[PDB]
Amino acid sequence: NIVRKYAKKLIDWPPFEYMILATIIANCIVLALEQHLPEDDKTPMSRRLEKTEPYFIGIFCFEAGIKIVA
Amino acid sequence: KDMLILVDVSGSVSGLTLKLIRTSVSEMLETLSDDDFVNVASFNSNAQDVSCFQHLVQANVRNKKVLKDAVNNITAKGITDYKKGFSFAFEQLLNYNVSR
Numbered sequence: 001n002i003v004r005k006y007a008k009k010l011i012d013w014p015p016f017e018y019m020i021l022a023t024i025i026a027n028c029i030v031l032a033l034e035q036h037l038p039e040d041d042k043t044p045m046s047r048r049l050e051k052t053e054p055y056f057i058g059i060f061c062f063e064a065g066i067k068i069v070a
Numbered sequence: 071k072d073m074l075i076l077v078d079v080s081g082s083v084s085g086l087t088l089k090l091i092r093t094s095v096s097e098m099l100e101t102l103s104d105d106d107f108v109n110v111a112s113f114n115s116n117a118q119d120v121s122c123f124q125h126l127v128q129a130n131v132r133n134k135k136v137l138k139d140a141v142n143n144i145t146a147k148g149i150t151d152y153k154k155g156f157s158f159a160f161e162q163l164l165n166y167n168v169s170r
């Protein structure tokens with residue numbers, strides 16, 4: 001598990017740090033748009049947004065994956 | 071009239087809005103005669119009657135008291151579904167087997 005020939009350390013680089021920087025901004029906007037309703041109620045828009053959390057989770061576990069293997 | 075009072079008991083009406091909704095429905099039933107038929111239905115992700123009446127009953131003193139005492143027992147919880155609540159409302163006004 002110290003397998004050299006990473007080829008992922010060269011992916012930690014100019015462009016894929018400026019895309020993570022943008023996925024984080026998108027995520028912060030999404031967390032801004034949310035509205036909390038009193039008792040289990042949800043606005044239509046919050047139900048709409050709850051269908052993006054898997055995308056962000058995917059990109060972030062991808063970052064953990066690439067940083068950890070590299 | 072043939073009202074059907076569709077209360078919205080979902081999450082977002084809890085607190086003051088529910089106090090005002092139950093007072094408003096009490097004072098809406100108060101404007102009903104004995105020639106008028108009423109039934110109170112409430113929806114949150116599925117519609118149901120607030121009381122034991124499953125159709126349009128007459129708005130006399132006893133029925134109005136039952137509807138008021140059911141309305142005052144109502145509680146707010148869950149997501150709102152206008153389509154499922156209006157299906158109920160429109161279906162209860164097409165029920166011609168009862169006195170109306």
Ligand SMILES: *[C@@H]1O[C@H](CO)[C@@H](O)[C@H](O)[C@H]1NC(C)=O
Nearest residue numbers: 120121139140142143144145
């Ligand atoms: C009506 O109020 C009684 C009194 O507490 C309560 O037990 C009951 O749950 C209420 N109605 C419904 C449908 O829950």
Ligand SMILES: *[C@@H]1O[C@H](CO)[C@@H](O)[C@H](O)[C@H]1NC(C)=O
Nearest residue numbers: 125161162164165166167168
């Ligand atoms: C009303 O009466 C008709 C005829 O008997 C019957 O088919 C129907 O199930 C009854 N109930 C409603 C809600 O229409």
Ligand SMILES: [Ca+2]
Nearest residue numbers: 041080082150
């Ligand atoms: Ca609502």
